[PDB]
Amino acid sequence: SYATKIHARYVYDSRGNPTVEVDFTTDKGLFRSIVPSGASTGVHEALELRDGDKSKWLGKGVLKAVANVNDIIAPALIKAKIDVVDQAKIDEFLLSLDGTPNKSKLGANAILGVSLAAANAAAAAQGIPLYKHIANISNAKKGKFVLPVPFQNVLNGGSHAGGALAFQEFMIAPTGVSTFSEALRIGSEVYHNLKSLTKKKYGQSAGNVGDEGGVAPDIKTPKEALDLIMDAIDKAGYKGKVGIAMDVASSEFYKDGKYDLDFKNPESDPSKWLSGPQLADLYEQLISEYPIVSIEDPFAEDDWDAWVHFFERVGDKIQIVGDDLTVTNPTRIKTAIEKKAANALLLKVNQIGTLTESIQAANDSYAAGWGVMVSHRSGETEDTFIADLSVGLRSGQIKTGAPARSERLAKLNQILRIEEELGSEAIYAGKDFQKASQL
Amino acid sequence: SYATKIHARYVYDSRGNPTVEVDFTTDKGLFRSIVPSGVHEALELRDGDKSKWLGKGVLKAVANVNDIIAPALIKAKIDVVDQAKIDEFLLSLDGTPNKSKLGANAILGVSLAAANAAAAAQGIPLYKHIANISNAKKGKFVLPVPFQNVLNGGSHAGGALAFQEFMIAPTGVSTFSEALRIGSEVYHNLKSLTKKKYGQSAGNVGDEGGVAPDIKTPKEALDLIMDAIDKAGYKGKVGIAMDVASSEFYKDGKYDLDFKNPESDPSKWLSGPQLADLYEQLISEYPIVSIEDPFAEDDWDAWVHFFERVGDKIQIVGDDLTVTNPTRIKTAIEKKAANALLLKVNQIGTLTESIQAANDSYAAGWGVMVSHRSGETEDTFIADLSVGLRSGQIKTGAPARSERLAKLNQILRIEEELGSEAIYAGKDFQKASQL
Ligand SMILES: O=C(O)[C@@H](CO)OP(=O)(O)O
Ligand SMILES: [Mg+2]
Ligand SMILES: [Mg+2]
Ligand SMILES: [Mg+2]
């Protein structure tokens, strides 16, 4: 099976900004993939190509990226007649057209849609589900399929919501149940309880949501957020069954070698900005005070010494996830493994730009004993690729939003479909999320 | 082409509540539909088990599809292209006047999925199959004006603002693509202005993707929208629509525009005529092109009087008035209460009945605005429905949250597919079905 037609268009993401959609046609039909887009994007991410025409979409058009697909990538790839099942060859071909380390000739947002749609087409060519094709090409361990713990960002801050809260994501992780369906039900019940409690304490507007569907109360401290979530877990009836995770996204508030926990205040007092050591101490206290099982981007994207020190302190007690640190990039992951800076990778296909490189990132992580959490971006779409990716890679953990806003539920609903299809051939990762690939 | 397998499951809607999804398999493949969620409505069946989803499970509706509808329909071997026969069969199976045995949520999923299978059986897009079975005027397809709910009040905001929905309608351009782009730009400008004026928190979004700052008066809301249109660079090109949802503040035959204040002075509540005056003033000061539920759901005389006043200058839309209900619709047409209907397919429960309600409206010279629900999904059926029915109007949210954008994105795909065989309804949205 090879591409007969490849056509790109722009569509609107969940924030109302344009992004790239690719239609990849073979003998088996038309396969569509849509590229997501971040807000708190790491400086080391592959290039997201935007038009910069201030008169259209506030400079956020993707007409140039779409044209790169239609006029450069499409005719070259179609001429090549590459078997879509050979994902590595598809991706090698796409990388050859760009020839830059950060995909800055064509744009990662031109390349990725083609890479992902090829994988969908390949699944169809073999008459297998996408998650099985991914398990094949990633060399996942053979046995039961592992369904991921849904890490649900139920309270949004940082760059994803207006208000004072600096830390980006406060997540629940329903690890203390035996099935994915139960975990999603519990997440939805805790979330609804949280919405009710948030409106009662902070007013109706606090129950409106951030970019990823979490409630967005205007609060200044992590303690206030965590206390709210603990109350929701308790009032929903699931005390002791629900872990908490954070994405600090600390690069967003790293200034003058320090960390501003009031960074959205134009008049933030710089005498109150924390050093690396001061911020590390705050985490150690929170990890003791709350059932926090995972912290992501606790220090800035190149603040290696701070990660290394913190890992020495608490790496055996919690999952420590690289996101902006690692940017789903094997070269950065190598450095992080050598330095002992983290013990898990946040896997974002659009940080690196091809499925093959994303899978290499995952396998490099697994080889080092790391966990992998497959992730959405804050600018998401109706695309559901990451659901199948999370299952195929046997990650045992996915981050794809609060159980609100359908760019989030679309992924969670797809896992429900996968769970039903597999029946007893699947197990839910549950408490084993961190080492799920080995199960 | 007939059903070889029909299977339902629950999935989660855009508010995190369960809803029904149907997989309908034929020789052409698997076709999926998902049902949305919000005495005159078809009834959605919920489980009421307070220990699961706070009583909002749809296990019973799902079981009705799997154990009752699927085997009966599969046995009957009905050609899916014959939507009317499919829906007649489904209605016969239930037999109740409001679909309360099997549930409207069980019935609609099968009805919509069958339509998708039927399009595939004929090798045509869903919007074309809908055009065919609805007997839409032959000629160019009409792409709808997106009525985009950018700013919320009423029960959706903590301020005094009594009116429920403020929408933009980018009518002053020649293409759907340009309309949607302008809508996105105006929305982003509105968000920015809202955060500046009311604080960063006021930028966080409601169920349909709009913002809900603490606003005091309709004038304050409309001035904010006008400022966003102007700052975005599209002065004169963008209409405004309102959903007043006036039943929410109708008390003792009067209209309390400060209904969220428990000490609202009843001597300041507006009479029907005073509220009509207010609307007339707003229509003269702002480019308001449509008002939904300007008067309460059974305050018929008020609608009739208001229609005689301004029915020739603006669209007047029934929602609570009409409830996608054939008899309420008849009454409204006979009384001359309004000139447009909100079409909510899940309020009536089959595609055939939805199309009948649209055609009854068109026959009376009414407009039809195809509508989302508050609880939406990644399903895009209503995009193809708005195009196939030649409605010229769709209400499917702000340009934020993908249960809203998925519909608008589908229209982009339809637009590209059609090229010169499509026209944008633009300023002609009211009578688009006759364009
Ligand atoms: O930092 C993050 O983990 C992401 C995903 O939630 O947000 P964004 O896509 O804006 O980077
Ligand atoms: Mg980020
Ligand atoms: Mg992150
Ligand atoms: Mg209404």
Author numbering:
A (entry chain A): 2 to 440
B (entry chain B): 2 to 39, 44 to 440
What text comes from the article?
The protein Eno1 (encoded by the ENO1 gene [C1_08500C_A]) plays a crucial role in the survival, pathogenicity, and antifungal drug susceptibilities of C. albicans. First, Eno1 has enolase activity and plays an essential role in glycolysis (catalyzing the conversion of 2-phospho-d-glycerate [2-PG] to phosphoenolpyruvate) in C. albicans, as knocking out the ENO1 gene renders C. albicans inviable on media with glucose as the sole carbon source. Enolase is a dimeric enzyme and is critical for glycolysis, where it catalyzes the conversion of 2-PG to phosphoenolpyruvate.
Two CaEno1 molecules form a homodimer face-to-face in an antiparallel manner. This structure is similar to the three-dimensional structure of Eno1 in other species, suggesting that the active site of CaEno1 may also be in the C-terminal domain. The 2Fo-Fc electron density map of 2-PG and the key amino acid residues were contoured at 1.0 σ (gray) (right).
